[PDB]
Structures are given as structure tokens and as C-alpha cells.
Amino acid sequence: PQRPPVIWIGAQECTGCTESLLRATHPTVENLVLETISLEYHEVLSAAFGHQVEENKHNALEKYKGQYVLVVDGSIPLKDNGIYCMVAGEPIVDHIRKAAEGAAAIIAIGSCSAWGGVAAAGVNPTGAVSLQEVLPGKTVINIPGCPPNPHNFLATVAHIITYGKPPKLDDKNRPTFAYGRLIHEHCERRPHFDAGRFAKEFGDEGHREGWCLYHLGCKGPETYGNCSTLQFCDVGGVWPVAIGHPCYGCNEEGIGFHKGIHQLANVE
Amino acid sequence: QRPPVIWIGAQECTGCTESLLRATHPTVENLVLETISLEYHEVLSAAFGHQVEENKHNALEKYKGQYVLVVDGSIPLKDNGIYCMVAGEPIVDHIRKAAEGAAAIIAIGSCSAWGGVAAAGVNPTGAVSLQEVLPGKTVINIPGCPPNPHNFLATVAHIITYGKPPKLDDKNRPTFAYGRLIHEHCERRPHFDAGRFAKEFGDEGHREGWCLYHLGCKGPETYGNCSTLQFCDVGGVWPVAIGHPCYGCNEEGIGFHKGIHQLANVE
Amino acid sequence: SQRITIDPVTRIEGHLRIDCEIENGVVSKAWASGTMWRGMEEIVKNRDPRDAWMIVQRICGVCTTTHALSSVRAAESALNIDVPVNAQYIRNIILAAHTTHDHIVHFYQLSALDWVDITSALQADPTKASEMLKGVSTWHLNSPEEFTKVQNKIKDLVASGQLGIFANGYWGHPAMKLPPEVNLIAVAHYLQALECQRDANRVVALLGGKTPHIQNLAVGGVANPINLDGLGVLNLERLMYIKSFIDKLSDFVEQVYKVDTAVIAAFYPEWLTRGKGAVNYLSVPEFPTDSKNGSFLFPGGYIENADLSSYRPITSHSDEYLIKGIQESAKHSWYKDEAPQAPWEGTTIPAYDGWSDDGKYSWVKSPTFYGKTVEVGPLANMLVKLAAGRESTQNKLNEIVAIYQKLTGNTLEVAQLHSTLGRIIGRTVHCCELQDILQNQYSALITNIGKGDHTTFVKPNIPATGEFKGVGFLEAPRGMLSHWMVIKDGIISNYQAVVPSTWNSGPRNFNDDVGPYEQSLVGTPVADPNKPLEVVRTIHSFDPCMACAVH
Amino acid sequence: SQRITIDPVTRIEGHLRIDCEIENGVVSKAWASGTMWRGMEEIVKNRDPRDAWMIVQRICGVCTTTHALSSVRAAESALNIDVPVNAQYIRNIILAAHTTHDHIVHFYQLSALDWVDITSALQADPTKASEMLKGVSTWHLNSPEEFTKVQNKIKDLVASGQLGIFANGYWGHPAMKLPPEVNLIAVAHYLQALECQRDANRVVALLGGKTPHIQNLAVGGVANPINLDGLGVLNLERLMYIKSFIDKLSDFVEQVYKVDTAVIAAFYPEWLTRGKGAVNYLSVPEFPTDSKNGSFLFPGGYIENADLSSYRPITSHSDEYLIKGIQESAKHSWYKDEAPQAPWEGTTIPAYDGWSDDGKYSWVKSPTFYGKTVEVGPLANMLVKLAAGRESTQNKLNEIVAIYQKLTGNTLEVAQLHSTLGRIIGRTVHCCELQDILQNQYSALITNIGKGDHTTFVKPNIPATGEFKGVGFLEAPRGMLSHWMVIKDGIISNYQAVVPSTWNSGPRNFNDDVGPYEQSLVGTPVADPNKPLEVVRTIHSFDPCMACAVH
Ligand code: SF4
Numbered sequence A: 001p002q003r004p005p006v007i008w009i010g011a012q013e014c015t016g017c018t019e020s021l022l023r024a025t026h027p028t029v030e031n032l033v034l035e036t037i038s039l040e041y042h043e044v045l046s047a048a049f050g051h052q053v054e055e056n057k058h059n060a061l062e063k064y065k066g067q068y069v070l071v072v073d074g075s076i077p078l079k080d081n082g083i084y085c086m087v088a089g090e091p092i093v094d095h096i097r098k099a100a101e102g103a104a105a106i107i108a109i110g111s112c113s114a115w116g117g118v119a120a121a122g123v124n125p126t127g128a129v130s131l132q133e134v135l136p137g138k139t140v141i142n143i144p145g146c147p148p149n150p151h152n153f154l155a156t157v158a159h160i161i162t163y164g165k166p167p168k169l170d171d172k173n174r175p176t177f178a179y180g181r182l183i184h185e186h187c188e189r190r191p192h193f194d195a196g197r198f199a200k201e202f203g204d205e206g207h208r209e210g211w212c213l214y215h216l217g218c219k220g221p222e223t224y225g226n227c228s229t230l231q232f233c234d235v236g237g238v239w240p241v242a243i244g245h246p247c248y249g250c251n252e253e254g255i256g257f258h259k260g261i262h263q264l265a266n267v268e
Numbered sequence B: 001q002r003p004p005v006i007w008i009g010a011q012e013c014t015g016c017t018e019s020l021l022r023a024t025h026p027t028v029e030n031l032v033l034e035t036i037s038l039e040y041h042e043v044l045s046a047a048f049g050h051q052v053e054e055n056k057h058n059a060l061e062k063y064k065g066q067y068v069l070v071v072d073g074s075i076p077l078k079d080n081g082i083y084c085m086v087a088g089e090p091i092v093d094h095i096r097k098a099a100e101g102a103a104a105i106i107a108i109g110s111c112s113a114w115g116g117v118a119a120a121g122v123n124p125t126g127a128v129s130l131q132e133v134l135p136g137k138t139v140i141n142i143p144g145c146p147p148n149p150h151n152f153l154a155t156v157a158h159i160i161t162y163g164k165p166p167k168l169d170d171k172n173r174p175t176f177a178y179g180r181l182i183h184e185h186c187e188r189r190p191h192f193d194a195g196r197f198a199k200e201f202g203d204e205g206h207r208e209g210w211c212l213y214h215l216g217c218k219g220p221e222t223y224g225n226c227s228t229l230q231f232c233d234v235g236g237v238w239p240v241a242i243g244h245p246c247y248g249c250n251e252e253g254i255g256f257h258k259g260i261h262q263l264a265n266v267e
Numbered sequence C, D: 001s002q003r004i005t006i007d008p009v010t011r012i013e014g015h016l017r018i019d020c021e022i023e024n025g026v027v028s029k030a031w032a033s034g035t036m037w038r039g040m041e042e043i044v045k046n047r048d049p050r051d052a053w054m055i056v057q058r059i060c061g062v063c064t065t066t067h068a069l070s071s072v073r074a075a076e077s078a079l080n081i082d083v084p085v086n087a088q089y090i091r092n093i094i095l096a097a098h099t100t101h102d103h104i105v106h107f108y109q110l111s112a113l114d115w116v117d118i119t120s121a122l123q124a125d126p127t128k129a130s131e132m133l134k135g136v137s138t139w140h141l142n143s144p145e146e147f148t149k150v151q152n153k154i155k156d157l158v159a160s161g162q163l164g165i166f167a168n169g170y171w172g173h174p175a176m177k178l179p180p181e182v183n184l185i186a187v188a189h190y191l192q193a194l195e196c197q198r199d200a201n202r203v204v205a206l207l208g209g210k211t212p213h214i215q216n217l218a219v220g221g222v223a224n225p226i227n228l229d230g231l232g233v234l235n236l237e238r239l240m241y242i243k244s245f246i247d248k249l250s251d252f253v254e255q256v257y258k259v260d261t262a263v264i265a266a267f268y269p270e271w272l273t274r275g276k277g278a279v280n281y282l283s284v285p286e287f288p289t290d291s292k293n294g295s296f297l298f299p300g301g302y303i304e305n306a307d308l309s310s311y312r313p314i315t316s317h318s319d320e321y322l323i324k325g326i327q328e329s330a331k332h333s334w335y336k337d338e339a340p341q342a343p344w345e346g347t348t349i350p351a352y353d354g355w356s357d358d359g360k361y362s363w364v365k366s367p368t369f370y371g372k373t374v375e376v377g378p379l380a381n382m383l384v385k386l387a388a389g390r391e392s393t394q395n396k397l398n399e400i401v402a403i404y405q406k407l408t409g410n411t412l413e414v415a416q417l418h419s420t421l422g423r424i425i426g427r428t429v430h431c432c433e434l435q436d437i438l439q440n441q442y443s444a445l446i447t448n449i450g451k452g453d454h455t456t457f458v459k460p461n462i463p464a465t466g467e468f469k470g471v472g473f474l475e476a477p478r479g480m481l482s483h484w485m486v487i488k489d490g491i492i493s494n495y496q497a498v499v500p501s502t503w504n505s506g507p508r509n510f511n512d513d514v515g516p517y518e519q520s521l522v523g524t525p526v527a528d529p530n531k532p533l534e535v536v537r538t539i540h541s542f543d544p545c546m547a548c549a550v551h
């Protein structure tokens, strides 16, 4: 039986978004690539290199025209005509625009591709921008986080395959099942917030009783995500706040990588 | 040499033993081969009948002053103990005898901890807690119906690794697992605070994961770790996360007394 | 005539005493006795019908889910509620996954040590043991290196001097017949079973909210909120997680449990000719798939006098023939009212007066079906399926038979299934068939949600006056379960559970006829009356649960 | 004579181009080029020192944790903070577990397909393949039935016509030397590796809060609240969970990964005589265990001109000899300032002018140690450990050598470790030794908490005036990592990372000397210049990470 094709392109990526797939359990990366999809191009895992892997991409773009899911991780650098990310001697923005032409669905995985992320922070030395900015005519599905829980991506792909369409998206084109609510509007430390029970420093008495991390700079009040409910790694009870560290807002433009760890969030 | 454990079932449904089969740290196979010596447990013993009663007597003598005694189920006192008879003797007599040489005594589950479902309603058998039948002893209570098995296993591990019980609250429950109300650490608290409530299963709010207070959630009057530790180590599995209110199974006077849909008192 | 008592019977759920008269090394008469009572039927009286399921689930934690489902079905029957089809699929998945866990634990952790000798495993050659399974199983964990590692765990345990749960077992008993190699294989599979059963319970937990004791039911459906696009509810990610565990069950069940069942038959073939408990068998259909509490995936029926060709089919949980036939007696039980009672008019008034061979000797009631004793459970269930011409069941039986034939050069015929080993075979067949139930019902759920149906719950109304009666049937791991609820002025005025182990373990009835456990023991050879291993072999084949039987 | 380009190099992290001149079928000169830059050093400038780690962790997600730890160590060095010993144990566990994941993924998912021919695996006899490993490994999942199942997955993939990531690989290439059986074994182990690496990352996650990109560090210690009696914090239950995953790693690492390393050496023995990258080697000590940022479990040092007997030990992260030696040049890199710069005075001013063989051809800087080129990473690390007479490392190497000898009847000498295969061997040894680091540090944590020490964090003060410099060293999976922070008026006035792949992949330096990747390729035979498999074999042995190299 034929599996739906996927083309995965890395731009200004740290490779964390690919590495997240190695933590996934439903599907596991081995079930993903053998049973769920045909991963037709992915530079991190391909047996083929060089001219052979570029052959594989061209064959796949033609053979599966109008049928493949395009996935991009990393921001796309526009400064100085795209020279800050060059693959096979051509700017990555050109590879991405070409692959976008025949895509059935386009997914920006991670905060970098979704809104510029860490690569576009501060002075933005390379003119890094989001996938949606380089593809203004297309609907890009954004799966933010640095990196997101891999199932935020895999359940989005599964929806496309199983039901023939994208999941419901909010007005930033993020899937509502994973990004439809503020972390602070579904955080198990909310009772402590409400009671004025706050950790003031790591290692203090309140911190060691699992109190609210607002005063350590928790950005849950201005960050959309499923980090408090879905959490990470499928072991139970693992997300940053549960471990004792405030949310940094890595999902959310203007929060993660812009505000200091210990800078307070605005509360609605 | 592994620390010895004697496990006695009284008026039990066997759910407290079955919880061990869901454990991952340790798994039940690592528990019985590496962590403890499980010297008597009727559900798992190769031996039966006179042979298993031999094993108990040998163990009570050999490991006097060293074994952890665990009891699940309530103890029926009505009509001189005849509602639970093992080898022709009331279970309360087996438990008192085993309690004499125990290094530590653990009531696993709400039944042994406070009477539980077996003592609810008219209490047909005069079911009481392990602490009530052992008035001279400190009983460590690990309530829930059944509790997360690690609430028990981490209590045993503390006894073995550090030589003493974990910190206990004033009902002799370990603070790491029962030190806080469910509602004082529930991820649906934001919805409670905003007036976002499910009114019926399947309605719009319920399907958005709103607070279950108005369906009768007993989180506001139940101590436990169900919202944080949760169940089965898969991530995101406890009654409220699945869509059903807390029933108060941990807590005397709540679970098995109040109706599912009866509202809790809020502090 | 020599008199023995087995008390406690271990590796069961709950508190059981078995007494036997032995004449010339053969059991001539037996008594089964449930020695613990809680009065769960009394505890649940006078409550809102909606509350019952949470309380009566605590009848048993081994067969968790079963009493919960049977209770809501009973209330739904009284109230005349049609359960939404998504709630049925979720209920079905839970029951099927649970039963998979339960049967695996039964074969390995509860039963295997009757047939398997741990100390003989220490003499095994791991390489020969592995070689013995070539062309019998394709299981990936039957290597000599796996067996050597298991052998070394046993060796370390024995050298420590703390055998614990393996101490004082029936090592070297004359009824132990497996070669060393096969004992070593069984122990490796015993340990591997624990991983499979954990995966099955992860399925249960993801839909139930935990296990033991699920918490997702309601009179009217389930509390799972279906919303593929919802955060914190039953969405596509959660469904994919569930599916990942469903998919992990099949290989162990087919390549290990099924194969071990055939192997134990091959080495203990005399156990196909003893342990017959009854000549009548009863099961109910299970796994409804329509929007009106019907269209069952598994059929039910009644077999009279071992005649499969003239069995009576049961296709509905409202079948008046099934309903009217069921009664229970307390003549030889510790309750006051002795005449056979239909469960809607049942009473449970304790009247303990001590043990008496000819009077009262058990807390278990004696159920009958139109006055006859009946075996329930996986044997009943398999024979009913075979009688109905269910090809799936015939094919699965044939796979077991083929392995047995390869090992012995003989076949199994239906007459040999009315036995201790036949009962065990039925259980294994049941477990194998449940893997297709899981696949089917998961796909049905996915497809239905995709058609736009996200409904899970119909809110009941309960009239404040009037009296009305409901009954909830379920084919539990150990057999036909029924809960019987009478509602009067909005509350439960009577609640009676008739539980599968009640049918099998119940004492002599109003006409002094002998129920299945007690009948199955007549003719059992006993080599050593101080160590009656042969007796617990037969009893264990029924998978006794005394908390269930007595409640 | 011929010019080739390999672009992209796959099965690495990030964006790499390799160019080669080939003369008479042998690489005569090569160029390594990092083709992507982000400017992470510039992005983190002018921020509070405490904020850096969360930003610079994003240099790389493959070697997640490493930049985070090196950044807080740098801030702690500038501020003169002594990290509490519980924070060290937690940091150590994370690094050790992470590196275990990383090395396994490298050997199997990144490297194996250079040496292994999946189409040849289809011709294998599964039984012979299993038979080949008897007396070589005690691994429990090397049965013929396991291999047959893997073979059938490959077969189904090939029959589908959608090879995906295996499409157009180097199947049948003359440099592929494994028999069919060994190719089938490697693929089975490839899939089994994915389960072990997941267990390693569960350890990381339980302490870090997630992975990739941990979130439990702080300048001053860690954010894990230690309280054995606390709900919702790092208590005994959580510690027991962590331990359960630590304990699952060892068997695969010892019985599979270690053994496969020896086997690949046995079939490709010529790869012990090529791929030498340098004559100087550098590693830092790792895993501090005291309350003053020292007492390292693994030693470090500098080896000059391959002379182990006269190596210089490094026992401290504040070693002024190590600190003063390190510079970087941009003469052949796309930056403006070309003279060698000490990293506290470093600049990263982009100056892209296109590719030129004799000018600028990479975004990677060229690091030197007292003016010399140096190899870093597992080979450096192993040689340094052998130089120090570390018995653990000699013993682990000897276990690999013994397996190799059993297969070939030859031995390995230290001279042969200065090679492509020697590099891979160092990595495997590192992974094996880390399993004892995990056991040791978990036990130290448990013991220390039991003595009454629950401290995890010292709150830093940062003076609002003055200029302070700090450097944070760490022995990362790919080698010595250093972050260099200048604080001025309370904020980061300069930030420079010198990353292990910078050392190895860096282009020709200020004196035009050739760095490790480029040097290692000289002399590589190339059978087919259109399919230069032999070149990527050597490059992959360094475990390139270009996001790291360039940042
Ligand atoms: S979003 Fe984060 S993890 Fe993903 S590529 Fe960007 S920096 Fe790496």
C-alpha cells in the first residue's frame, strides 16, 4: 500500500524539530517512516547524499506533484540575497519556493519557521523571516515551540491524511488542539497563583512545595500552548514548570527570545 | 538479602494488588526479584493451603522485627470476625499476630486506611480500618481506590533506603502524595476561577476541557496527587483529564458517601 | 475416605476454601466455600441509580470495568435509554483491552505455577529450549540468550535463600511433567507476559482515566469528551496514543500465549479428559455496535446437555427467555431465604451458622437457569461460538489444534474441550479473538468521528414515583455477568448481582445438585493428599474470583 | 584528475559542503564548508548574563544540553560562583544520558548506512546471521525470528516502490564489504537502537523538563526543587522513575553497540590506516563532583605530536594554559577580522564574498591551540584517557579489541586508533564508560539528599559596573566546547562560542594549515567520483554538526 509523501527542508534550523521525532511514541519515528508516511526527502536521515539526494528531491517533486506535505524547520534568511543559507550552491529560499509550488499542505514546524524564532531575535543578523512571509500566496500551518512536542506535528499530519483536510486552526494558523489556549488558563499551579503562593527563588521553601512560578518570570500568562496538558516525552509530569522552571514563552512571538527569563509577564 | 514484606488481604477487591501490575518504577517483576522479598502474598504464591500458611509462620519468626506488613481491605468486626475467615480463623486475628513483629505497617487503599466502600452505607459487616484494629501502632495510610501504586512503592522505598517512613500528615498519609488538595493543584483551576464549567457530559464546555465542579467534582475536598502524579505513567491520565469529576475516593466522608453529582464544599 | 482442606487457595482473586473427600487417591466429593462477604448489594441500596456504578465497580479490582459497565447497562435498561454509538465503541475498547490483560495474567501469573516447575528450569539447556520452538512460534524473544538471562535470574533468586512467592512450591511433584527446557521457556514467557499485560492496561487507562477502577462511565454513555480539535479532551493525538498500545498486544498473544496453550495441552493430555463441570453452558452476546444497545460483535446462547447442534441463540440483552430463567438459591449458603429467587425479588440477608457438610458452607449463592446448573466463562463462550458457526472462532481453535497436532500427532475433538484444558483453551481463543475486536472498534470510532458524530452521552431523567426494573448483561472474562436493579421513588430499592464465579463456584443448590467447581473435582487423582496440586489445577482453570462470587 | 562537490552532506546535523580534488582515484586535496550562519553570538549580546543559556542552547538541538551547560558555566566562571553539588550531579546525569542518546543515534542513524547495504540484507539467511553472533554477544534480540521480521520490513518497503530515505543509496558499491547476514544484523540493530536512545532521553526529560532543549538550568545551579516529601517536585518517586530508565541503557550499549563497533572494524580493517585528521589532540575534564566546580570523574589533557607518554594533563576548568592557548582565525572564513583572536576579544563580523579555493570558503572559523591545529572529540578524549592510565578506558578498549581479535585473529595497536575507525571506536568506548557515570552520579545524588543536603541553587549577584570575563568548558559528544562571556556594566558585552565541530571542520587557518576534516580526506581512495561514499565515511566519523560549527 502507498504511503503519503512528505518533503522536509531544513533552513536556519538547530535540528531540534527533527530530533523531537526521535522522542515520539505515537507514531515512533520508525513507524512514521515505514508505515505512516513516505519520507521522500530529509537530509538528516537520507542514505543518499550530494547529487543523489538532489535527484531524489527532483523525482519526488515531479512524481508527487499536488500530493506531498512540505515541512520546513528553521527561519529563512533574506539578507544579502539569501546567502546565509545555501544548499547545493543555491539559497534555501529558492528550494523552499520551488517545493511550495506543488505542495498539498505546507507546515512550518517550530518557532523559527513559524515566526522567525531565536534566529530572528535581537538585531536579526541574517534577516531571518517565517515560512509564511516567504510564501505569501499560501496557507502555512504553524506548529510553534522550540521545539514543539512532536505530536503537535504528527497529529496535524495524521489529520491531513486520515480526514483529507487540516485540523481547525486559530487566526495564526496554529492547530487549536495544541495551541488553542493560554498555558496559564490550564496550568495546575493556578491555585497557587490565585492564593499568592509564589516561589521567589529556585531552591526556596515555596519552590520546593511546587508553588506558582509567576515571580520567577513565568510566561504562561501570555503563551499559547499545550505544555501543561500534553507535556513532553510521554512519561507523565514532564514540562518546564513541573520540573521547577518558569515558562520562557518559546511558542510565542514577542515573548520567547525577546523577554528575559525573569522578566514578568502581563496578566490579562 | 532483600527486605521482607508480608501482604495480607482482608475485605479487599484486589485492586490494590492489581495496581502493582501497572507500576513501572519498579515494575512488579523488579519489585519481587530485586527490591523486596515478598514472603507472603496469596495472589502470587506458588504455595497454597497448609504450605502457604507454613511460609507465613516461617517468615514471621525468621524476620521478626524486620518485615513490612501491608494490609488491603477493611477488617470486619461484626459477629466476632466471621465475615472474613482464612484457614478457619478471623482475618483480624491473622493481622494482629503479624502486626506484633512488624518493623512498619502500611494500610494500602481507602478500605484499610479508613473503611472505604466496604464500610459505607449501612456497613453490613462492621468493617473498620487497620488503624482501628491496631490501636497501639503507627499505621501508615496510603488511601485511594486504588492508589497510584507508586504512592505505596515510594513509601516502601523510603523505609528501605533511609531506614524510616516518609513525612506523614496528621492522618498518617505520606505528604509527597497526599499533602495537598487536588483542587489546590488542578490544571482546570483557571476555568473554575473564570466561571467556565461543564454542565453535562458531551456539552460544549465539557468538550473544551472546562472545570468539572458543576458535575460534582470532589477535588475541592480531597487530598491527593491525582492531578500531578496522575496514573499509569503514560501522561495526561487521571479522572478529570479524561472528563469525569473526582469522586473523592481518597477521602473519608466524600468517596462512597456523596453522590457523583453532588457538589463539593469550597474552602 | 480421607478428608482434606485447601485453605487458602492461592493464585486466585479473593478468599476460597476447597474441601475434598478422597477415596483411594481419587476425589469423590468436594465443597467450594467463599469465606469473605462485604454486602455490596446492601451498600448500594437506596442511592441514586446514577451512583451505583462507581460503588459496585468495587466488587472486584481484578475484573475491573466489568461491574461498572454491567451497572450502567442495568440502569439504562430500567430507564429505557439508547446509548450513543461512540459510547459503545469506547466501552467495547475498554472491555476488550481489560479482558486481554486479565486472561494473560490468568494464564501466566495465576495458573502457570500449577504446571511449571521452576527448579527443573535450572537444569535446562537454553539452546535446546530455543531449538524446541523453531517452526512452532515466530516470537522474537525465544533466543538462547533470552532464556539464559531468565535462567540466571532464577539461579540468583534460589542462591539468595529468599524464594518469597516461589517458596515451598510443588517442585518435583509427580504431576509436574514438563521437561527442564519447557519449564525454562514458560518462566521466560511468564516475565514477558507482564510487559504485554501492562500495554493492554495503558489502553484501558487512556479511555477510563485510570485502572484499576475506571472512571469514564455514566448512565447514558461516557464522560470522554470527543473533540478532534480540542485541547485537554479526547482528540486525535490521544486516539493515536491509544492505537499505539492496541497495536502492541497482538504478537505476544498470537506467538506466545496461544502457542503456550497448545504446548501445555501436548504435555498434559490427560487433562483433556477430566475437570468437566457441567453439561449446560451459557453466554451472552457482547460488544454492541448500533445506537440501540444491540448488533453484537460476539454471539451468545444456551447449550443444553452438551448438544451444540441444538443450542438456543441469544442476540439481545432484553431476551425474555434469558431473563426469566435466572434464579439463585441460598439453601447451602449463609443467607436466610433459601427458596430459589429471581434477582429482581432477591434478598441477601446474612445467616452465618458455621460450616456444615450437609447444610450451609459458603457465602456464594447457587444460581440456576430454569432449574439447572450451568457453567459460564470462556469454555461456555467458545462452545456457543462454535455452535453458532462463527468462523473466526473455529479458525482460531484450529490454529491451536494444529500446533498441538504437530507436537503430539493427535487432534482435539469437541468432546475433549469439556475439560480443564478445554476451559483454558477457550480463554486463550477468547484473548486472540479480542485483538480483532480492538482493531474493529478503534476503526469504527475513528470513522464515526470523521462522519461528524461527536456525541457521547444522553442525560437521563429518573421519575420520582413508580417502580421499574432493569437488567444489565455483560460477557466478562470469567463469564456471563448480570446486575439487576429495581428503582422505586427515584432510588435503588433492590440491587442484585449474579456474577460468573457465582455460577461456577456456587455450592449445592435448592435440589442439592452440584455446581461446576464441585462437579469438576469428582474423579481427580491426588498423588499426595498433603499437596493436592491436581485439585488446584482444575479449580484454577475456572479463573476463580471470590470477591466477584460473593460480593 | 577531477573536481567533485558533495553538497549537501547528509546524515549530519546542518549544512555542509565537501569539495575534493581527485588524482589517480585518490583524494589529493579537500575543502570543508559550513554553508549556513545565524549569528547566535550577536543575538545573545547585550542581554543579562542569566538569559544567555536559554538563547545559546539553540545553537544546536542534536547536542542539546551542551550549549546550555557551557553557557551557565561561563557565567558562573565570570561571577566566581561555586555550584552546589546536587546541581552538579543533576547536570552530570543530563549530560551523560544525553551523550548516550547522541552517540547511539550517530553510530546507527547517521553512520551505519555508509557501511551497510540494505538491499544485500534481503539475500541473508536469518538463521546464519543469528548463528554468526554466538559467543560474540549475549544480546537477547539476535534471534533468527527477530532478523526474519526485520528482513520482512525491508522486503515490504522495497516492494512498495517508495524507498524514501533509503532511495538511491550506495547499494552494490565496491566499498560495501559486509556479507548479507551482517547487513541484516546491522539493520535490526539500527531499529533496536531507536528504543535505547528513547530511554536515554527519558532520563534527560525527567531532569530537564523536556528534550530537545532542557529547561532546568540557571546561572547558580538548577531549577529542580529537591524535596523527598514534596508533592509536585523532585521527590523519591521521581528519582526512582529516573533510575528505572538509567537501568535500561546498559545492555544495548554493551551487547549491541560495542559489539557492532568491533564487527565493522573486522570487515573494514583498511579503515584503521586512513582518516588521520591531526597529530594534536585536546579534551577537557568532565563531570565535576565537588562543591567548587572540580573533582572531575573524566580527565582531560593535551597531546602533542601523537605522544601519549608526554601529554599535558588538564584537571581544572580554570587552567590558564588551556585558556591562553585558544584562538580563532577567519582568514579563509567569511568574516572580516582575519588575525588569530583570543575569544574574549573575538568578533564575528560577516563578510561573504563567494567561494574561493585560496580565499574564503566557509562560515566556520579556524581554531588553533598555541598556533596548532587540533582534533577534538571521542578520539581525543580516548587517547587522553589512555595517556592518563585510566584503567576503565583501557579495559573497555580491550573488550572491543578482544571481539575484533576473535573475528580476525589480529590485534589493534594504538597507532591504528589514529584513523576513521579509531575515531568511531573512541565514541563507542565513551558511550560505554558513560553508563558508569550515570550509575555513580545517581547514587551520589541519592546519598547526598539522604545526608540532609537539598540545596540546588545559589542566587547570583551581578555588579552594575566593572568588566569581568568568564569561560565555560565542557566535554561535549563531539569534543571540547567553550563559551566565552565578557560582562560589562551588567550585560553581555561579548559572547564567543568555540565549538568542537569548529575545531574539526574549520577551514585552512591563518598560516594555511589544514584542519582535521580536510587533512583526514587526503589519501582516501574513491572508486566512483559520481558516488564518493569513501569520502563521507571519513567525514561522518567526526560526527559533524554544522549548526554547532558555525552558530
Ligand atoms: S524552533 Fe527551536 S528547536 Fe526548532 S529549529 Fe528553531 S531553534 Fe531549533
Ligand code: SF4
Binding pocket: A183, A184, A185, A187, A188, A189, A190, A191, A193, A211, A212, A213, A214, A218, A219, A220, A221, A241, A247
Ligand atoms: S504563572 Fe506560570 S506557573 Fe503560575 S499558574 Fe500561570 S502558567 Fe502556572
Ligand code: SF4
Binding pocket: B011, B012, B013, B014, B015, B016, B072, B073, B074, B108, B109, B110, B111, B112, B116, B117, B144, B145, B146, B147, C058, C061, C212
Ligand atoms: S481500597 Fe478500593 S481498590 Fe483497594 S482493596 Fe478497597 S475496594 Fe479494592
Ligand code: SF4
Binding pocket: B182, B183, B184, B186, B187, B188, B189, B190, B192, B210, B211, B212, B213, B217, B218, B219, B220, B240, B246
Ligand atoms: S473543581 Fe475539580 S476540575 Fe474544577 S478546578 Fe477543582 S479539582 Fe479541578
Ligand code: FCO
Binding pocket: C060, C063, C066, C067, C476, C477, C478, C479, C481, C499, C500, C501, C502, C545, C548, C549
Ligand atoms: N470476569 C469477572 Fe469477575 C467474576 N467472576 C465479574 O464479573
Ligand code: FCO
Binding pocket: D060, D063, D066, D067, D476, D477, D478, D479, D481, D499, D500, D501, D502, D545, D548, D549
Ligand atoms: N557535541 C556537540 Fe555540538 C558540536 N560540535 C556542541 O557543542
Ligand code: F3S
Binding pocket: A145, A146, A223, A225, A227, A239, A240, A241, A246, A247, A248, A249, A250, A251, A252
Ligand atoms: S518555554 Fe516553551 S516548551 Fe512550553 S512551557 Fe513555555 S511554551
Ligand code: F3S
Binding pocket: B144, B145, B222, B224, B226, B238, B239, B240, B245, B246, B247, B248, B249, B250, B251
Ligand atoms: S476519585 Fe480518586 S483516584 Fe483521585 S481523582 Fe478523585 S481521589
Ligand SMILES: [Mg+2]
Binding pocket: C041, C365, C496, C497, C498, C499, C550, C551
Ligand atoms: Mg448477588
Ligand SMILES: [Mg+2]
Binding pocket: D041, D365, D496, D497, D498, D499, D550, D551
Ligand atoms: Mg564562534
Ligand code: NI
Binding pocket: C013, C059, C060, C061, C062, C063, C064, C545, C547, C548
Ligand atoms: Ni473479579
Ligand code: NI
Binding pocket: D013, D059, D060, D061, D062, D063, D064, D545, D546, D547, D548
Ligand atoms: Ni550540535
